Amino acid sequence: LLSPETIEALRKPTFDVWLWEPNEMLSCLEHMYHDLGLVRDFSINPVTLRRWLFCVHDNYRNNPFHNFRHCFCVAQMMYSMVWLCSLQEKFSQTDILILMTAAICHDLDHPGYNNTYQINARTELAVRYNDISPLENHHCAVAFQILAEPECNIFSNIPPDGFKQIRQGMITLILATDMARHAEIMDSFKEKMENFDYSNEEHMTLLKMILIKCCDISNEVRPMEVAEPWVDCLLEEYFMQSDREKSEGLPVAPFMDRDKVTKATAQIGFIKFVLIPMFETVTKLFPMVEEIMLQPLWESRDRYEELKRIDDAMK
Amino acid sequence: LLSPETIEALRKPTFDVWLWEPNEMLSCLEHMYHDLGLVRDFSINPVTLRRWLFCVHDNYRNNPFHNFRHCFCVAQMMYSMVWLCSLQEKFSQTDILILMTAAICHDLDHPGYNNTYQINARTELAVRYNDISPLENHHCAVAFQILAEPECNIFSNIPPDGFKQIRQGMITLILATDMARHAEIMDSFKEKMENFDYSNEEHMTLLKMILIKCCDISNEVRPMEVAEPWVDCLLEEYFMQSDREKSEGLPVAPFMDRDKVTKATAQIGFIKFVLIPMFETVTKLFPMVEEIMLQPLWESRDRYEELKRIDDAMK
Numbered sequence A, B: 001l002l003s004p005e006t007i008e009a010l011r012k013p014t015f016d017v018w019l020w021e022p023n024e025m026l027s028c029l030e031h032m033y034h035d036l037g038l039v040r041d042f043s044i045n046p047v048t049l050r051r052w053l054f055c056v057h058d059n060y061r062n063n064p065f066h067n068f069r070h071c072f073c074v075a076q077m078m079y080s081m082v083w084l085c086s087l088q089e090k091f092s093q094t095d096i097l098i099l100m101t102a103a104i105c106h107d108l109d110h111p112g113y114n115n116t117y118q119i120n121a122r123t124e125l126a127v128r129y130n131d132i133s134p135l136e137n138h139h140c141a142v143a144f145q146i147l148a149e150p151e152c153n154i155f156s157n158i159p160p161d162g163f164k165q166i167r168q169g170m171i172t173l174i175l176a177t178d179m180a181r182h183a184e185i186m187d188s189f190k191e192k193m194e195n196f197d198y199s200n201e202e203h204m205t206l207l208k209m210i211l212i213k214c215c216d217i218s219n220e221v222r223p224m225e226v227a228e229p230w231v232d233c234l235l236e237e238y239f240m241q242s243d244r245e246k247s248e249g250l251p252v253a254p255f256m257d258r259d260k261v262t263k264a265t266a267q268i269g270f271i272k273f274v275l276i277p278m279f280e281t282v283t284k285l286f287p288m289v290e291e292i293m294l295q296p297l298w299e300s301r302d303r304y305e306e307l308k309r310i311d312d313a314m315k
């Protein structure tokens, strides 16, 4: 249970996610729902909220990166963004609920190997989802198989009008965390940014997809003490893919090959080309993000480049 | 064995489809992949082609409408419009192969209850496909499961690069048979119709989708000896659903309700507001479409609107 200091600390992207076990992180997730007013406002059963989170945890696998601790991070970032940008002013509790609950469920039952792998290798998955985000489809399908189980049904006191709405909302947001759609989504978002209209449901739907996207890859925003380990974790998972592809005679992405990559090169690429554009467009709507999220993205890039000439002198 | 009155009758849309038993209709679909070049071309095995088709028979269901026979009508109709329109000049044999093969697999394993039931009943299927064309994804999914079996893999001898173009093609096509996407498809089709261009893959891709749709719903193009028994069938399914749907508290469509439908009324709008204006914008690119198809339609509309006043006098 929760230290009033921690209680404060948890809302900030600083927060050291490595000082926490699973079952403590679960106690943190429980807190966020209570704190955000979700439990009161959607008559969530407090036992059933605990049981669901266990049910959820249970169904993430032990991958180097795509494990429960990713999910917790993404959630905790969404919670963080909710306080930073005062999102409870700009969204309904039913939107807020959707964001949190998506965030938690978004990379569920991840097998460790992305869609590219799923597709190329004709996996039962990609067969079953016809090469359209077989992962991210599955994530949802699990997410609701879980919620179907009455003891893990935290929506049990929401009537069908509510549920239908949340279901669509979650399914959108989870499916947007395929990166194949990153520029697609980022373009459409910039288009609507010219004259952003908090009245306009398509604008908010985009905004929401962005927010979870920001979270689905916020790692580097955190302190580097905290952030860097994830990179190793990610790479470890990546090389674990390519080795199996190189084995089975399947395509290998340049970002996933042992020989071609370095930690320093790949992250410079990702920070400058993917992250800072996304967190820039979002800074337009919420200025308070420059300071808290762009700053330690700028720093993290400045570090990786000094680490680049150190990767270049050695080899 | 096929008599050459049959081998003549198959290439045109009149072809009566209630005569032939299953094993005989398989022979027709064999004839078509030899006759259209695809056996000679794609190095297709002559026994993997009779296994894949006997297999594909086993994985339709005994549905009042959406059955193997529906699969035959649509492909046999799809055959009819290769000669009719002379599509072997405009389209590649890849495009010819996809279109044929899609037609054959397009409503695979249909349970006889539409997207709107699966979803509203929160059925395993709907949960899995997240309300996104639940059936048209399931059909496509069952398809490529047969063609992953090595004793049915007709594409065995095809490259993955060819297979990958046959994949992300047959896919695009079967997901277009969700009439729920009808409106959306039509309008994007007339968007290109302004200035049509057989060079462009997209315009050509859109064309391909249109063509296959016209087939799923191509019953009243046929002679009303042949064409009218598919409105006793369609409704036998439609009612079976709306019996259970009322019986499980679930919304019922007007158009499926027992006591709001009389065959005639149903097909008049289904002809006036769906079939006619589709085939009309098919005919701008291929004029011979007018003669053969838009005719037996216009007359089936007349036939039904009189059949209407026999119904209206009675009630």
Ligand SMILES: CCC[C@H]1CN(CC(=O)N2CCc3ccccc32)Cc2c1[nH]c(=O)c(C#N)c2-c1ccc(C)cc1
Binding pocket: A179, A180, A182, A216, A217, A218, A219, A220, A234, A235, A238, A255, A256, A261, A266, A267, A270, A274
């Ligand atoms: C080895 C390079 C590390 C670098 C670049 N890399 C980018 C990448 O692999 N891909 C492959 C598909 C794609 C589409 C558009 C842009 C990039 C990429 C992955 C990544 C990086 N840094 C990160 O902090 C995170 C995080 N979170 C990710 C990351 C984030 C999400 C997921 C699903 C996977 C990886």
Ligand SMILES: [Mg+2]
Binding pocket: A106, A107, A177, A178
């Ligand atoms: Mg994911």
Ligand code: NA
Binding pocket: A057, A058, A059, A060, A061, A062
């Ligand atoms: Na687990």
Ligand code: NA
Binding pocket: B057, B058, B059, B060, B061, B062
């Ligand atoms: Na069967």
